[PDB]
Ligand binder design. Sequence first.
Ligand SMILES: Nc1ncnc2c1ncn2[C@@H]1O[C@H](COP(=O)(O)OP(=O)(O)O)[C@@H](O)[C@H]1O
Ligand SMILES: Nc1ncnc2c1ncn2[C@@H]1O[C@H](COP(=O)(O)OP(=O)(O)O)[C@@H](O)[C@H]1O
Ligand SMILES: Nc1ncnc2c1ncn2[C@@H]1O[C@H](COP(=O)(O)OP(=O)(O)O)[C@@H](O)[C@H]1O
Ligand SMILES: Nc1ncnc2c1ncn2[C@@H]1O[C@H](COP(=O)(O)OP(=O)(O)O)[C@@H](O)[C@H]1O
Ligand SMILES: Nc1ncnc2c1ncn2[C@@H]1O[C@H](COP(=O)(O)OP(=O)(O)O)[C@@H](O)[C@H]1O
Ligand SMILES: Nc1ncnc2c1ncn2[C@@H]1O[C@H](COP(=O)(O)OP(=O)(O)O)[C@@H](O)[C@H]1O
Ligand SMILES: [Ca+2]
Ligand SMILES: [Ca+2]
Ligand SMILES: [Ca+2]
Ligand SMILES: [Ca+2]
Ligand SMILES: [Ca+2]
Ligand SMILES: [Ca+2]
Lengths: 269, 275, 269, 269, 270, 269
Amino acid sequence: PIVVTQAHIDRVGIAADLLDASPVSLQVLGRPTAINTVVIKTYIAAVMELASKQGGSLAGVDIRPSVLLKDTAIFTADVESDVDVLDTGIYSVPGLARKPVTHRWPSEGIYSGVTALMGATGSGKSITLNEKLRPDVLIRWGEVAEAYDELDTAVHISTLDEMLIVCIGLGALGFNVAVDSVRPLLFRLKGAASAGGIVAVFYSLLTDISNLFTQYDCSVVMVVNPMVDAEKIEYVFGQVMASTVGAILCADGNVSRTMFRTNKGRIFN
Amino acid sequence: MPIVVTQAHIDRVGIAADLLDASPVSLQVLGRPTAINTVVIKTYIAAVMELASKQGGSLAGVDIRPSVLLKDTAIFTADVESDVDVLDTGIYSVPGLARKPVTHRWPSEGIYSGVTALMGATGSGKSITLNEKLRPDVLIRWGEVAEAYDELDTAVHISTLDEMLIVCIGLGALGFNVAVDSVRPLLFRLKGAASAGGIVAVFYSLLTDISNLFTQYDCSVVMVVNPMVDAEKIEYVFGQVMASTVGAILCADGNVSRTMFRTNKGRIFNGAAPL
Amino acid sequence: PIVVTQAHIDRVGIAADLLDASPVSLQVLGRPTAINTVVIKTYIAAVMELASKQGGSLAGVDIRPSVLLKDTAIFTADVESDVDVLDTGIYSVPGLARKPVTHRWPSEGIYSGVTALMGATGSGKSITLNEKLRPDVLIRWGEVAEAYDELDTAVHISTLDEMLIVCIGLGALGFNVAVDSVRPLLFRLKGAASAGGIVAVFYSLLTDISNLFTQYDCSVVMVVNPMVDAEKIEYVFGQVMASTVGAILCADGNVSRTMFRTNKGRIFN
Amino acid sequence: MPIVVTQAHIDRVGIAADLLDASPVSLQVLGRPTAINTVVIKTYIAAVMELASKQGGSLAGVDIRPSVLLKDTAIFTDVESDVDVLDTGIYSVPGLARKPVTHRWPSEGIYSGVTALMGATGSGKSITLNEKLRPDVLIRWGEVAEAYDELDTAVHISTLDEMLIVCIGLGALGFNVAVDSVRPLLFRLKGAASAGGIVAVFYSLLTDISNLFTQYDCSVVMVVNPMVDAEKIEYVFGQVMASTVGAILCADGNVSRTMFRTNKGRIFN
Amino acid sequence: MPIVVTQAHIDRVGIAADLLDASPVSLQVLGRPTAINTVVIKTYIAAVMELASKQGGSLAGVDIRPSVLLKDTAIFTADVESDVDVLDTGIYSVPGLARKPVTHRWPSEGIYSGVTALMGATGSGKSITLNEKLRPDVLIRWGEVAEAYDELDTAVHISTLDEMLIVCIGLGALGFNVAVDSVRPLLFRLKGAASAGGIVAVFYSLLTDISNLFTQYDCSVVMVVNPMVDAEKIEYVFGQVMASTVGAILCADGNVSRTMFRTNKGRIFN
Amino acid sequence: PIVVTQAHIDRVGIAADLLDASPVSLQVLGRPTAINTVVIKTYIAAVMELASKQGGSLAGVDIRPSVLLKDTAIFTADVESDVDVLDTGIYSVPGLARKPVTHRWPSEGIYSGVTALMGATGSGKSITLNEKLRPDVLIRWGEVAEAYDELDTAVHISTLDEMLIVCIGLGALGFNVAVDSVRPLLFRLKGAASAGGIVAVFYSLLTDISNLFTQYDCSVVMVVNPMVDAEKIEYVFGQVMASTVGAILCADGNVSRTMFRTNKGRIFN
Ligand SMILES: Nc1ncnc2c1ncn2[C@@H]1O[C@H](COP(=O)(O)OP(=O)(O)O)[C@@H](O)[C@H]1O
Ligand SMILES: Nc1ncnc2c1ncn2[C@@H]1O[C@H](COP(=O)(O)OP(=O)(O)O)[C@@H](O)[C@H]1O
Ligand SMILES: Nc1ncnc2c1ncn2[C@@H]1O[C@H](COP(=O)(O)OP(=O)(O)O)[C@@H](O)[C@H]1O
Ligand SMILES: Nc1ncnc2c1ncn2[C@@H]1O[C@H](COP(=O)(O)OP(=O)(O)O)[C@@H](O)[C@H]1O
Ligand SMILES: Nc1ncnc2c1ncn2[C@@H]1O[C@H](COP(=O)(O)OP(=O)(O)O)[C@@H](O)[C@H]1O
Ligand SMILES: Nc1ncnc2c1ncn2[C@@H]1O[C@H](COP(=O)(O)OP(=O)(O)O)[C@@H](O)[C@H]1O
Ligand SMILES: [Ca+2]
Ligand SMILES: [Ca+2]
Ligand SMILES: [Ca+2]
Ligand SMILES: [Ca+2]
Ligand SMILES: [Ca+2]
Ligand SMILES: [Ca+2]
């Protein structure tokens, strides 16, 4: 189940302070788009109210944003992916001047941010995620019908707005949030593929997503499976390590390589 | 050759209407998420049942084509380019099922509701395997040249993607074993930059979105997917398709080279089961 | 000459019925465009009236649509080849539920549809067509001045609309229509080249053209010459076999391979 | 060096006007078909004859340039190169149903149309043209300052409209017109390169240009030098032979291969 | 860790304002040339000096971020595509200096004003070399994940390209040793057809335009440049970057592989 | 210094004449754009007045167009580089019917036009330019801070308009003008790369620039260093020789190959 501890209730105020304190945006190949912080706060309030009506034990089905919120929009006419960078400007989510909040998951003493669970198709990413990682909240998005969908920890979303709402909203409260998968975004990345058979803005997006979680004290594990050649996966994994707080590589059902940025330092395997 | 409507199908009509009304769905490709008008599918089911009633249960595939039964065949309800910022359009994937999906005996025993993808190079024996080994109840024929399968009473000739989804969701929800030969009109018009495997990445997302659309409406559909891909990259593309569908079949030299089915007994790779 | 028999005159009514019975469209990389059936009927009536001015014998020059019709348009603001496929929709010309009408040309018992005469430049396609196939009507499009242009069977067109008018119009009446060449269309096909150095929509167009002829009981032979590498022609020919009712490959002035879908079944060489 | 107007040229003026008025023509590349204003070519012929009358018939190439004789040099009366082929339509200039008028230049008994003077850079194309071919009128387009520019046969143009005006205008009258070179058109041909490292519409354009000259009884030699690999030139030359009435290949200052479509048939070397 | 304002910096304030007003500048990429609003940089300098006055000259990088000091962070003053005719937009390159550039002691002795590119593969030791071996006065952090360098009092966290240029031109002109870790948010968003070396040609033009912008405002800036390039193609790109920057440093296996600096004693290669 | 001789003063009238006599344009992948000749004349007049105020000895800094002219625009809504060639038309600057004016620089008896100083990065182009070629006026564009910027011959420009103003303006008067570099124009050439890893319109632009100088009796040396592979430079230099009046190849700090079109003929090394 998804259980709401006193620790989560005590974080509600802090989560609001974090969201209000820093105005954030996101950019991909178009123009920077602001994130409406209010929506995330509204989601937290709705989750806590429902957790209250229950015995602290919540069902992932009941906490999906489409059910709790009237509108699921986070981003507040239309720009092409091939527009001059000087006409749109460039935005990256700012870093944290203070020391980031540490976590015990996915690794001991890991800083707040994003962890990328990498590997070829059928390498055992989903298996590693649910058996070895054991997340508190499992966001299921753009994945086919599996055994993980019947889990009470599973929260089924449709949009990128919904993913960020659940990730920032619940992650800030202290929950160990995971996403299986981020394929709907990755498989719709438009642009000229750079070195490694993948668009360069992919690495910028991982950093922007990681810093978004670092700023809101979230520890999120994302399954990242982009369309890349069997031999080019090693290069891409190395590049992703330079763009995320955590990185896990899967091969033949087992964990091939690891990287975690902890309070004890950067740890490689 | 005929399409027979059992009491089991008649009893599913209400259930199907509820499934459609219960969840609002959309679809996206490289542009803006587009809503699916559920009403049209319900209207199609009502028209099929009414005609099944006039005839003696038994129906001809020719008579159940949407262009004949419905005044308008539109399912999707100004114009966006395939190269527009992903943040200005947002991203949509059809949501998964929180409950256990309805199991089926076709195309494999104890299979979950969703989509099965019948892969293979040209002349690998996809259409042969589909009609001889699989034996579907309803055969949707789309963007295929004149073959023996067109003279079959199970054959329903469509022209649009809207029509394909109407027949697939409409009849599939009622319990019919629906098949699509081919899905090529869609595949050959996929605009975008080709990813690893000489095919657009959104192709795999579309298969998952189509699979979940059928999982939500308790459909068991087999779609024959013919990719414009090099002889050596077909193995990679299949491996990728397996991770995007409830069922996958590879064809090579008139036979079935590889299979994958997500059953109630678990995920089965290359089983000892004749189709 | 192009001789009009009583058999052709008796088909006029049936041709009009076939055209009115089914509304058709066509699509390439843009949006589906409807085919104005009326124009084809008007062309048939004009050919029959001229046939009547002569002794049933017609000169190919006199039956060109630009001469017989006030407007040659068949397709009834502007869409790019890289627009969302969900905004335009997808269209394929529907198949025939009934048995297709059989023909004696280009092969015995062949079903109505299209035959693709393939081969490298100077492989003998035009020679094979005019000497071995010997068509009743020879549509000449996008080909330089040759001996075939002085033939009374030759009808010189300029547009794709004109090609379909003569192909559907005369083909429905029972004439053995041939197109040399379909290069104006092929060489202007915009889009990213798929496996085999050719746009994938090329194979969809051949199927849509074939089914358009199957629906109107036409037996047409089109010279399909692709800008493809000398060794990649075998792959493309195999791909075309899956998209047409007939397929003929030319090499060194001789017929290399054949494929025909007949009443006796699919025949390979 | 001078351009002399014979009685034979004066007697062709009426016929030339009759050929231009008889058939309405257009041209297409990757966009939409654009009509050719025939009147402008007639106006040019009348201006050349009027000047030939004032002088002794001995005209200077400098004095017969369209920019000097005509107030407006436009022959064609905004669409992207990546637009749906069904929204623009397809156009190819129609073939001649009658036998084409034969010429003694560039080869004996050659049919009216276009001849492509091919070869690598510095293979001796310009040398072969002026020394071995000896053209009556030498159109100079997109070429650096050479000895051929000081010639009284040289007519310096700037636009494609001007090229067609001088080619059709003077060529119809019986003059042996040559173009060195067609490089500004070829190097501005936008689109995805097909087999041989060159856009497929290049071969369609050569056929459309050839048929335009076949219809107006012109015998034109165009030096065609597209950006192609040193070893891929043999493939491209073979493909061009299937798209033109004449084809000449240059290597090490000499003529490597030749192809001409004559009244005695197609002659290869 | 702190950012100290010397009398030398205070004496440069007037000169900096003169340099900015004297020459109107612009920037171009694949679109149309866009003017740089000089006033914003002057306003930033005034805000930094006023805060340095309230403190004891000792400033925290966090307090000097433009988003905190300025109401509006825009430097560039409807929308053009990256594939538009070059003749319809025109071409702009920031002009060179007719006079001798103002030399510095950092990143190398007697190096002319401009930009230095800190190159290398991912995890080659660029960030390590920057903070340990280079020791910058001001460390601009942009498009980089949470690291130890973010807790430094020299660290100034930006979000936009406008902010980067404000801090680089503003503080660099006063004489500060400014560094950017990194410029990945601009590089990874560079739209266009990749030229020889698996990278867009306008990348080299941008480095020269950025270099000259610093040369004109007597700025000594070190930018870590890490574009998506193949493991073996990095040598070619580094050689090409040397022809586009005043300084160039290559990193390999945590150490400095190669160097290039344009100094008063001449161009020095390793 | 930049010294103004009586020979330069005597050319002022001839320069205005040459400029008024022929209206010119320029085209790249868009539409042809006219060059305002008046601006070049205005620049010449401002340079001569300043030369007359000073001792004839000028400073490159004082003759920059941005300082002498109120507006630096030469070209007089927005077209994409992928637009139909038939909708924009094609323009090439016309050739000279008369003999081009000869020069003693960069080679003896060389015709007026452009010389391309080619080579890989650090091949010695800028060293060869300033030590071996010794230009009168040195235009500095798109280059980092070097020793050449402190020179009194150096004139710092920002736009393509400014480059043409100084090149045509001072070049017509008899000055030996050089551009280091033309990289801001080369590196911003949008379009599909042809054979040799470079856009085909690059060669057309060199010919158009050369002919622009041939028409205005200029002798200009431009260092041309486009992004091309280390082994593909030989092919490109070969194509450039067919597009310019002069061509110099640099390697290992010295001159590898040369080509000059002189009054004594074309000289190769
Ligand atoms: N092609 C295959 N053949 C056999 N077993 C496979 C195949 N693909 C996947 N599997 C099995 O599935 C497991 C991986 O499951 P899963 O976690 O869902 O992979 P992923 O999330 O990386 O796509 C493997 O460890 C293996 O047991
Ligand atoms: N090139 C060929 N030569 C011979 N037989 C062929 C050829 N292509 C296909 N076939 C035959 O057709 C069968 C496949 O038919 P079909 O099911 O329609 O293929 P698909 O649907 O995959 O295109 C093969 O098993 C074989 O008997
Ligand atoms: N380059 C060539 N050299 C010699 N003969 C050739 C050449 N190209 C074609 N031919 C001749 O022309 C014949 C083919 O003519 P044709 O039917 O017009 O070819 P296609 O229509 O395929 O282009 C060949 O069989 C051969 O006799
Ligand atoms: N790189 C070169 N080295 C030596 N001679 C050359 C070179 N390029 C051209 N030539 C000379 O120029 C002649 C070709 O001149 P030209 O007719 O103008 O060629 P093209 O028009 O094909 O470019 C050759 O026969 C040769 O004598
Ligand atoms: N894949 C790796 N395996 C082991 N150590 C690594 C790896 N990647 C980076 N490192 C360590 O990190 C150091 C580089 O850190 P850093 O300066 O942040 O690199 P960069 O800024 O170039 O990405 C290396 O010297 C090494 O000690
Ligand atoms: N990578 C390098 N390593 C060493 N010296 C170099 C390098 N690149 C250039 N040089 C030096 O600079 C000289 C070339 O200078 P320059 O003319 O400015 O080059 P460019 O051709 O880029 O204009 C060479 O002769 C050599 O002394
Ligand atoms: Ca998975
Ligand atoms: Ca089939
Ligand atoms: Ca032929
Ligand atoms: Ca030449
Ligand atoms: Ca770093
Ligand atoms: Ca240099």
